[PDB]
Amino acid sequence: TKQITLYTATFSPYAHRVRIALEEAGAEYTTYDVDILRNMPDWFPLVNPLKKIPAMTFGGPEVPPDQPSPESAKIAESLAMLEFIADLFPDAKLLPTDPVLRARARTFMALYENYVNGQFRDVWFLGTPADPLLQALEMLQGALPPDGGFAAGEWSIADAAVIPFLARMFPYLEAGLGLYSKEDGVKMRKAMASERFARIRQYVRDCRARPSFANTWAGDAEQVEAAKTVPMLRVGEHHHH
Amino acid sequence: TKQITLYTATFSPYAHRVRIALEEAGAEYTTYDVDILRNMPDWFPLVNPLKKIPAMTFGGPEVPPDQPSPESAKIAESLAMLEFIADLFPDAKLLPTDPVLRARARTFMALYENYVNGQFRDVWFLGTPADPLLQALEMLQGALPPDGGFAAGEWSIADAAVIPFLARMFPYLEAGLGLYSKEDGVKMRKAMASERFARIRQYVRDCRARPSFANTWAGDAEQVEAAKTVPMLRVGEHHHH
Ligand SMILES: N[C@@H](CCC(=O)N[C@@H](CS)C(=O)NCC(=O)O)C(=O)O
Numbered sequence: 001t002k003q004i005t006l007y008t009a010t011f012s013p014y015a016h017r018v019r020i021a022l023e024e025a026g027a028e029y030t031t032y033d034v035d036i037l038r039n040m041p042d043w044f045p046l047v048n049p050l051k052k053i054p055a056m057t058f059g060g061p062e063v064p065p066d067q068p069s070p071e072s073a074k075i076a077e078s079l080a081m082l083e084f085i086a087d088l089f090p091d092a093k094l095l096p097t098d099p100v101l102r103a104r105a106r107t108f109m110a111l112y113e114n115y116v117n118g119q120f121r122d123v124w125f126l127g128t129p130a131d132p133l134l135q136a137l138e139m140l141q142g143a144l145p146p147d148g149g150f151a152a153g154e155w156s157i158a159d160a161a162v163i164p165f166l167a168r169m170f171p172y173l174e175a176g177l178g179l180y181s182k183e184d185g186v187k188m189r190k191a192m193a194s195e196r197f198a199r200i201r202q203y204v205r206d207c208r209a210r211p212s213f214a215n216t217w218a219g220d221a222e223q224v225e226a227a228k229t230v231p232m233l234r235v236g237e238h239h240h241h
Numbered sequence: 242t243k244q245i246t247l248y249t250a251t252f253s254p255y256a257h258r259v260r261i262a263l264e265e266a267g268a269e270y271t272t273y274d275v276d277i278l279r280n281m282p283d284w285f286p287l288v289n290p291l292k293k294i295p296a297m298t299f300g301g302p303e304v305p306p307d308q309p310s311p312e313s314a315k316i317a318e319s320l321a322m323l324e325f326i327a328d329l330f331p332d333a334k335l336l337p338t339d340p341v342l343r344a345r346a347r348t349f350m351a352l353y354e355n356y357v358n359g360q361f362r363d364v365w366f367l368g369t370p371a372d373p374l375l376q377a378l379e380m381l382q383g384a385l386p387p388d389g390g391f392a393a394g395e396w397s398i399a400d401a402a403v404i405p406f407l408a409r410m411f412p413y414l415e416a417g418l419g420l421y422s423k424e425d426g427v428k429m430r431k432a433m434a435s436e437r438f439a440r441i442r443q444y445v446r447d448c449r450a451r452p453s454f455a456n457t458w459a460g461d462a463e464q465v466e467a468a469k470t471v472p473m474l475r476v477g478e479h480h481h482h
């Protein structure tokens with residue numbers, strides 16, 4: 001019964017993770033956009049002292065999201081929100097019940113967070129070399145069940161954690177977004193269309209086909225435009241190695 | 242009934258996390274040391290293809306740890322193992338039952354992994370300036386309940402995740418182990434003894450006082466000697482400015 005408010009931004013893959021889980025849970029919830037990278041409201045540190053999107057409030061009296069209540073619980077960090085939503089909506093089975101299959105989901109999230117995410121960040125925002133990102137993506141692909149299905153078999157929050165980043169990769173590459181070189185752009189586009197990455201392409205299609213993705217995605221072109229508002233994606237800058 | 246084998250190393254804070262949780266669970270389990278950084282056994286990629294410690298096998302036939310069975314479940318990533326042990330031993334209450342308090346536990350783990358661990362790595366392995374690490378520790382300290390207790394109130398896996406790193410900090414500093422300069426070593430020792438950090442000292446004492454720590458710690462001097470075997474800690478080497 002307690003209210004859920006998610007503070008979000010269209011460009012943000014971290015916020016996207018939590019919208020997907022809330023959709024899969026069938027939750028009632030409010031979203032409120034925050035211009036976190038160019039014009040943070042003065043009240044925003046009340047919902048997240050770290051000044052990051054996403055932010056979540058839970059419970060407390062019903063109030064406008066720009067008038068946050070001190071009585072609501074303030075939850076930070078997208079992966080902690082994913083586990084929270086699973087805990088709140090057990091009947092939605094957002095994690096397996098088998099402990100080993102649950103561990104597959106948790107391991108997949110850790111593999112993404114510890115080895116892949118930083119490579120997406122460094123290639124796109126610093127223009128570091130693409131080969132380590134492709135190696136990390138092949139490792140992640142290797143953890144998927146080979147015959148099809150999601151990270152832990154049935155869909156889980158592990159797939160909410162990862163699809164925002166993988167689904168952005170393809171249209172960002174096609175639009176030439178990112179500080180990496182022309183040569184590394186060609187390399188990544190060829191690699192991601194090659195047989196080496198067939199399995200992760202199927203995974204991306206399977207995740208994108210679910211309503212939870214459709215209903216939380218602005219469209220490829222529109223997401224590309226939101227990403228162009230990110231200050232660190234300085235247009236006309238490229239790094240070469 | 243299903244066997245647990247943890248592949249370990251004394252120097253490793255990541256392995257230490259999991260030993261602490263297994264002790265708090267009252268689990269029956271085997272530990273097997275692996276010289277992962279200097280002389281990895283050729284069978285080790287059968288239990289963890291990432292070639293990292295810790296590694297875990299679960300179930301399958303009882304076999305010597307250096308003869309792992311392909312029938313056992315292979316579990317990687319220390320935080321996934323922590324959540325796995327909580328799932329396996331629900332009566333041990335390794336997480337709260339209340340969803341909001343569970344989320345405090347998960348947020349505290351994410352704060353450490355996302356903002357603190359990489360600063361420890363920079364300072365100790367690269368000798369980068371200490372101020373960003375002290376800032377990150379002050380943030381983590383701020384997430385603790387100010388009047389006492391563990392990260393989520395009662396002890397949880399969040400405290401297993403973090404105490405291996407905080408507990409190494411003080412004796413490593415006293416030994417001057419790590420690539421930072423004497424000047425930054427003095428600065429960190431003074432800061433960690435000052436009233437600014439009284440709350441995190443109380444937290445370290447409170448975690449260390451539990452049997453799960455005593456039974457998984459070699460002693461300060463012994464832990465320092467094991468850390469000196471870590472190539473990346475470059476014993477006798479320091480970077481300046
Ligand atoms: N680990 C955080 C990362 C969130 C994050 O980095 N969000 C970006 C937007 S995509 C942000 O808010 N940046 C503002 C800042 O860093 O000051 C999470 O998983 O929720």
Ligand SMILES: N[C@@H](CCC(=O)N[C@@H](CS)C(=O)NCC(=O)O)C(=O)O
Binds near residue numbers: 278
């Ligand atoms: N995210 C991993 C980190 C494990 C890790 O980095 N272990 C180190 C020593 S404590 C290691 O085994 N390194 C071997 C390697 O990187 O190849 C975990 O949480 O379990």
Ligand SMILES: O=C(c1ccc(O)cc1)c1ccc(O)cc1O
Binds near residue numbers: 011170
């Ligand atoms: O730009 C990215 C990004 C995300 C996924 C991907 O496949 C390529 C680039 C990004 C990554 C993290 C973030 O907080 C914001 C971002 O815009």
Ligand SMILES: O=C(c1ccc(O)cc1)c1ccc(O)cc1O
Binds near residue numbers: 252361362408411413
């Ligand atoms: O050297 C460390 C370490 C751990 C805790 C601390 O307070 C300072 C340094 C270390 C050693 C091994 C490793 O795999 C990771 C590490 O951060």
Ligand SMILES: [Ca+2]
Binds near residue numbers: 143144
């Ligand atoms: Ca595989």
